[PDB]
Design a protein around this ligand. Structure first.
Ligand code: MG
Ligand code: MG
Ligand code: MG
Ligand code: MG
Ligand code: MG
Ligand code: MG
Ligand code: MG
Ligand code: MG
Ligand code: MG
Ligand code: MG
Ligand code: MG
Ligand code: MG
Ligand code: MG
Ligand code: MG
Ligand code: MG
Ligand code: MG
Ligand code: MG
Ligand code: MG
Ligand code: MG
Ligand code: MG
Ligand code: MG
Ligand code: MG
Ligand code: MG
Ligand code: MG
Ligand code: MG
Ligand code: MG
Ligand code: MG
Ligand code: MG
Ligand code: MG
Ligand code: MG
Ligand code: MG
Ligand code: MG
Ligand code: MG
Ligand code: MG
Ligand code: MG
Ligand code: MG
Ligand code: MG
Ligand code: MG
Ligand code: MG
Ligand code: MG
Ligand code: MG
Ligand code: MG
Ligand code: MG
Ligand code: MG
Ligand code: MG
Ligand code: MG
Ligand code: MG
Ligand code: MG
Ligand code: MG
Ligand code: MG
Ligand code: MG
Ligand code: MG
Ligand code: MG
Ligand code: MG
Lengths: 54, 36, 169, 296, 211, 159
RNA sequence: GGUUGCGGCCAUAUCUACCAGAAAGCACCGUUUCCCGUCCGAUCAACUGUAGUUAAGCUGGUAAGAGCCUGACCGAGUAGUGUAGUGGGUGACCAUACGCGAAACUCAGGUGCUGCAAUCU
RNA sequence: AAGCUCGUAUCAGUUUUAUGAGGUAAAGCGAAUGAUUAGAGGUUCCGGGGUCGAAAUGACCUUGACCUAUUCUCAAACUUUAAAUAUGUAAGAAGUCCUUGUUACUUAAUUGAACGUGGACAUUUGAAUGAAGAGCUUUUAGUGGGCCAUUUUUGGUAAGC
RNA sequence: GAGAACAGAAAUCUCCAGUAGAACAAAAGGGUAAAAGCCCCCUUGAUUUUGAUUUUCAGUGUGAAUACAAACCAUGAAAGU
């Protein structure tokens, strides 16, 4: 038998029950998906800056 | 000796094998000169 | 005011519309070949009509582009065949002109029935100096109206040379 | 302008104009894009082109980088400059291309500092070579050949500037197969022929080929070369002459002051006509309404 | 066979014209839109009376033609074939659909059924030009065509000259000056813009700065 | 049935900004991007490689990666009741430096200026933005400004 | 200021018709031994800068020109639109309140600006 | 439900300001495309008619279609233009600025890139309003037939469809 | 559009105008003019390695696609692709 097909009725109310909430920005964010050639060098760049300060 | 084989090539995009739009029997003439 | 509006012939193109392929064409091209000195160009059929008994891309015509002094030779060599007279039609309003002659043996060349006889379309395309702009690669430009070949100015050039006459109307 | 041809207001309203330097048939933008643009991970380090153009018989060789507000010339060197260096006639021959090539091929490197370093090839036996980098030291200046709308035919003079630019010391990536003396079938190069073209052996041999079969076109063609008593032989040495002459001094000295700029601004503005005032036009057409419609 | 006109009075759907998509549409039942002395000149007929809709509805081509003939007939029959220029100003481009009744209302997309013109409020339906001596007669023509129509529409006297977009004094100022130039049904006007030489061969009567 | 392909419904969104078709002008390849730049996303219908999906049109984000032809842009997409981090590998031709911060940077330099000149003489700093305040009293004169008394206009027809 | 080479914005730059352009520069232009390409040295390649012209290119100016760009309480606070009422109307639809607000039209003005290098009475 | 880490810290179905994106409403058609009424003027060695015609690339009438400047009228799958409402981002200490280490990346180049050291400027520290605080984790129920009203809106003559 | 023996509405040749009115396997919509279309030349990157990303989404899978890394190649004077 034919039932209802689709609605977004009331789905905004549910989303806002526990709200829509901001994306929690982070200083020092991830490096996921950054040019590996850059990462490879940046690695040694910083082991350099690290071993420097001894 | 038959001369060297140089063949002209065409710049026309049209590739279908069909007469163009003006090539229609509509544009002939009834009693055109027809040397007798 | 012309020190430089001095009309040349740019190309002369002969063309025999041999409405079929094979032997008849490869001999009608031989005709232009011992008329031109150059190797002529086979033209393929554009589409297929079958009233003219042809097929698309069938190699049904040959033509040849000849330029400069060698063009004046063949132009006059055929202008004789037409008694140095062609008509007030037969001139493009863009300045060029051409004519047709059957029985191509009236151009000096002998008969040799291993070919037979062919007709030719003569077309003479003309221009003043500095036609380069229209056909060079860099800075391709179009010529001023002051300078383009017109019809009235090119029949007068045709009368003035050759002692031709223009025709009715 | 045939009546059957004039263009509608609709045609012109909806018409998109190309870029000015394309309307002027001067820039291949499709080529410009791929010459200029840089790898985004280098982030200002500019892509220096070696533009090589050809006036009707004068040779232009600037080295230009591009900027959002306009291409900026690092060095320029003109084939009219060779008078300075030992060359007087036909400054469009393949060997003037090589010359100016060499000229900017040394001009920049002193403007840079890699002059004692990266001197290029000096003993020009016409070999195929690139200015290789020095062990434990700066890499050579790298620039690429903007040949504009020239059509890169085998053995053309745009590549003559290349050979001299390369031979002076610039690192300009290039193959050999369009250097005069590239063999069509065997994928190899004749250096004996290319050294000729670098020096003149095709115009020297033109001189020794007209001095005893046609003195009536040698008459005017090459007029200058007789008017200063130097025959063909003898040509390799007006060019090696200059090769030394520029490798010794590249320095661009410019032209003498000679009716300083503001004077030119005066004596050309005589001929620059300026537009008419709106009231002038208003009266200029108000003359016409009286002069034509008002029953003569 | 033709469905009663109440089923399509209102603008319930978005315009459904004949189209590359719709494309099966019957022919409009009204095919001639200018009537009377349509070849006449603008000076021939200064007065203009409109039939204007006061509703936001749809007029069937069936009713449009049916009402033009009823009006145009009355006009000629009492004024003469060339006494008026009748223009109907709404062309019925909107295709009405219909569901042709062992199945149900599964897949119930209609087939084209008839045409209709979609008229706004204040939209002019009939525009007719004559000379003021007629107005009583031609007004009475529109009044009779009105009875062919669903929904109130009202007659109105134009402040304009015939089918021009200028009121009568503004027109006379324009012509008794010499900026109007007759054309087949209509006239052209003297622009202050464009080429001056090409402005003077046409409208030469002007530029005397006088009549 | 229904159709939901990657470029569905993009007809006018990827349309070409009329009388501006053709090869893209070269300034957009001369612009430079560093990690952390805030860029806008508008797709360039001429450049089909590396183009953003329609959802990120009109969207703005931050550069997290730079490569030879492309920037990597970080975008905060709201799916359900929470934002997720979406990472787009976009071609330079679909990317635009953003004036979305330009006030704030123009106004931080101007703030420190007024602050320099505020610790320079008696400290009157006054450099936070306030919204438009309502008007203050003023005196309207009638010298050559005596008023036109307007009445409503009757109903005409005009057609 | 002119001009060229390379440009950025890409019509205020394009289109139509006329007219003017000194100097330099571009250009058109001469040649076919050589590299190179063509049916055709027309294009493309090379050689000369010598033999030749501002005719065209290119620059600038003219036009109640077309197009384009800009402005205006020009139209227009119109059309549309967010919000409100136990507002009017059988309805179709409509007015009012608190806000936002076009497009056409019309008139006015405008017709490329500018970067790097070199060069010029 | 159990809490846990914290607490003037961050927080928001809101406004403001700065900067974006969009092609709906309206509008437009003497702008493109596609429709559509009407005349007026053009144009053929080049559509058919048709007097003079032996014919003519012939004059002439005729109806045709094309061109020109006008005219009435239109579009969910048309459009130059183009709202309202909705929509992305930004409004600082994770700030701004300077000084000059690291690297195998990158540059002609200690050039840049990235990350760093030292240093300079404190709550008018950078709009409004609000905040019985903010953030975080685990586990589990029921539900997964919906229906109605204003507005927008598809199909249907329509329906308490 | 104007022009050239047979040649006709339609064969082949030339010039002029031409913002795309064409063409790009196909449906349609985008997009494209020294091209993305047409002719030619050289080719096998339609290849090798394992990851990240976008769309659908549960932010599973599959399809498809994007931008890098590491190879070995193609093409071009070249930057490039
Ligand atoms: Mg079921
Ligand atoms: Mg049900
Ligand atoms: Mg269900
Ligand atoms: Mg083709
Ligand atoms: Mg002259
Ligand atoms: Mg035959
Ligand atoms: Mg117009
Ligand atoms: Mg190229
Ligand atoms: Mg409704
Ligand atoms: Mg409906
Ligand atoms: Mg039924
Ligand atoms: Mg049943
Ligand atoms: Mg069905
Ligand atoms: Mg069906
Ligand atoms: Mg409407
Ligand atoms: Mg009624
Ligand atoms: Mg009007
Ligand atoms: Mg669908
Ligand atoms: Mg274009
Ligand atoms: Mg692809
Ligand atoms: Mg001069
Ligand atoms: Mg050449
Ligand atoms: Mg002149
Ligand atoms: Mg020029
Ligand atoms: Mg100009
Ligand atoms: Mg104008
Ligand atoms: Mg409202
Ligand atoms: Mg209520
Ligand atoms: Mg109500
Ligand atoms: Mg109203
Ligand atoms: Mg839509
Ligand atoms: Mg629309
Ligand atoms: Mg609408
Ligand atoms: Mg509009
Ligand atoms: Mg239209
Ligand atoms: Mg049409
Ligand atoms: Mg007789
Ligand atoms: Mg606005
Ligand atoms: Mg918001
Ligand atoms: Mg508070
Ligand atoms: Mg609290
Ligand atoms: Mg649960
Ligand atoms: Mg279920
Ligand atoms: Mg259940
Ligand atoms: Mg309610
Ligand atoms: Mg129901
Ligand atoms: Mg397609
Ligand atoms: Mg495969
Ligand atoms: Mg789905
Ligand atoms: Mg999941
Ligand atoms: Mg699964
Ligand atoms: Mg996946
Ligand atoms: Mg997968
Ligand atoms: Mg799929």
């Amino acid at each position: 038998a034919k039932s209802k097909n689709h609605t977004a009725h009331n789905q905004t109310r549910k989303a806002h029950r526990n709200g829509i909430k901001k994306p929690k920005t982070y200083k020092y964010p991830s490096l996921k998906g950054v040019d590996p050639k850059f990462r490879r060098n940046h690695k040694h760049a910083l082991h350099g800056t690290a071993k420097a300060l001894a | 000796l038959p001369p060297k084989e140089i063949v002209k090539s065409n710049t026309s995009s049209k590739k279908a094998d069909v007469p163009p739009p003006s090539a229609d029997p509509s544009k002939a003439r009834k009693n055109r000169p027809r040397p007798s | 005011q012309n020190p430089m509006r001095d009309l040349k012939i740019e190309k002369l193109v002969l063309n025999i519309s041999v409405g079929e392929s094979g032997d008849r064409l490869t001999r009608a091209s031989k005709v232009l070949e011992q008329l031109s000195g150059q190797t002529p160009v086979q033209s393929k059929a554009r589409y297929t009509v079958r009233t003219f008994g042809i097929r698309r891309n069938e190699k049904i015509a040959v033509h040849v582009t000849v330029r400069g002094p060698k063009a004046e030779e063949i132009l006059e060599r055929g202008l004789k065949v037409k008694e140095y007279q062609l008509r007030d039609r037969n001139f493009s309003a863009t300045g060029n002109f051409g004519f047709g002659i059957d029985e191509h043996i009236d151009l000096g060349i002998k008969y040799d029935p291993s070919i037979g006889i062919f007709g030719m379309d003569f077309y003479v395309v003309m221009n003043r100096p500095g036609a380069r702009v229209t056909r060079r690669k860099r800075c391709k430009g179009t010529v001023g109206n002051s300078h383009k070949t017109t019809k009235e100015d090119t029949v007068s050039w045709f009368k003035q040379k050759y002692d031709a006459d223009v025709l009715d109307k | 302008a045939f009546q059957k041809d004039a263009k509608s207001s609709a045609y012109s309203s909806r018409f998109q104009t190309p870029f000015r330097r394309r309307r002027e048939g001067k820039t291949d933008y499709y080529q410009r894009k791929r010459l200029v643009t840089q790898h985004k991970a280098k982030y200002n380090t500019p892509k220096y082109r070696l533009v090589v153009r050809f006036t009707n018989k004068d040779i232009i060789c600037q080295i230009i980088s591009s900027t959002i507000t306009g291409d900026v010339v690092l060095a320029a060197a003109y084939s009219h400059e060779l008078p300075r260096y030992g060359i007087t006639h036909g400054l469009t021959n393949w060997a003037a291309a090589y010359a100016t090539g060499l000229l900017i091929a040394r001009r920049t490197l002193q403007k840079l500092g890699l002059d004692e370093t990266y001197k290029g090839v000096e003993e020009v036996e016409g070999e195929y070579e690139l200015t290789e980098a020095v062990e434990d030291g700066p890499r050579p200046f790298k620039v690429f050949l903007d040949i504009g709308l020239q059509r890169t035919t085998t053995g053309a003079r745009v590549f003559g500037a290349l050979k001299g630019a390369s031979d002076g010391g610039l690192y300009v990536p290039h193959s050999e197969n369009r250097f005069p003396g590239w063999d069509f079938e065997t994928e190899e190069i004749d250096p004996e022929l290319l050294r000729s073209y670098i020096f003149g052996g095709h115009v020297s041999q033109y001189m020794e080929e007209l001095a005893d079969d046609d003195e009536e076109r040698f008459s005017e063609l090459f007029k200058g070369y007789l008017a200063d008593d130097i025959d063909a032989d003898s040509l390799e040495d007006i060019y090696t002459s200059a090769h030394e002459a520029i490798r010794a001094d590249p320095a661009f000295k410019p032209t003498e002051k000679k009716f300083t700029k503001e004077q030119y601004a005066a004596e050309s503005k005589k001929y620059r006509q300026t537009k008419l005032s709106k009231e002038e036009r208003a009266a200029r057409v108000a003359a016409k309404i009286a002069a034509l419609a008002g029953q003569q | 066979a033709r469905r009663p006109a109440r089923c399509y009075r209102y603008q319930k759907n978005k315009p459904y014209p004949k189209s590359r998509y719709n494309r099966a549409v019957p022919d409009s039942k009204i095919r001639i839109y200018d009537l009377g002395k349509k070849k006449a000149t603008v000076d021939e007929f200064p007065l203009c009376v409109h039939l204007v809709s006061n509703e936001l509805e749809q007029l069937s081509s069936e009713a449009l033609e049916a009402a033009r003939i009823c009006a145009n007939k009355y006009m000629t029959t009492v004024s003469g074939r060339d006494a008026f220029h009748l223009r109907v100003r709404v062309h019925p481009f909107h295709v009405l659909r219909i569901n042709k009744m062992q199945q149900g209302m599964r897949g119930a997309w209609g087939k084209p059924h008839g045409l209709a013109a979609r008229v706004d409020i204040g939209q002019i339906i009939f525009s007719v030009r004559t000379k003021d001596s007629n107005k009583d007669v031609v007004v009475e023509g529109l009044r009779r065509a009105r009875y062919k129509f669903p929904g109130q529409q009202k007659i109105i006297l134009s402040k304009k000259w015939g089918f021009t977009n200028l009121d009568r004094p503004e027109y006379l100022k324009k012509r008794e000056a010499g900026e109007v130039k007759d054309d087949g049904a209509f006239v052209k006007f003297l622009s202050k813009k464009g080429s001056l030489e090409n402005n003077i061969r046409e409208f030469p009567e002007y530029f005397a700065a006088q009549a | 049935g229904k159709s939901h392909g990657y470029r569905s419904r993009t007809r006018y969104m990827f349309q070409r900004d009329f009388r501006k078709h053709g090869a893209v002008h070269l300034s957009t390849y001369l612009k430079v991007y560093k990690v952390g730049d805030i860029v806008d996303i508008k797709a360039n219908g001429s450049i089909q490689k590396g183009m953003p999906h329609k959802f990120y049109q009109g969207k703005t984000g931050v550069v997290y990666n730079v490569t030879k032809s492309s920037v990597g842009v970080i975008i905060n997409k709201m799916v359900g009741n929470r934002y997720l981090e979406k990472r787009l590998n976009l071609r330079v031709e679909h990317i635009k430096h953003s004036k979305c911060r330009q006030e704030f940077l123009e106004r931080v330099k101007a703030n420190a200026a007024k602050r320099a000149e505020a610790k320079a003489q008696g400290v009157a700093v006054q450099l936070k933005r306030q919204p438009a305040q309502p008007r203050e009293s003023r005196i309207v004169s009638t010298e050559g400004n005596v008023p036109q008394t307007l009445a409503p206009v009757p109903y005409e027809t005009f057609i």
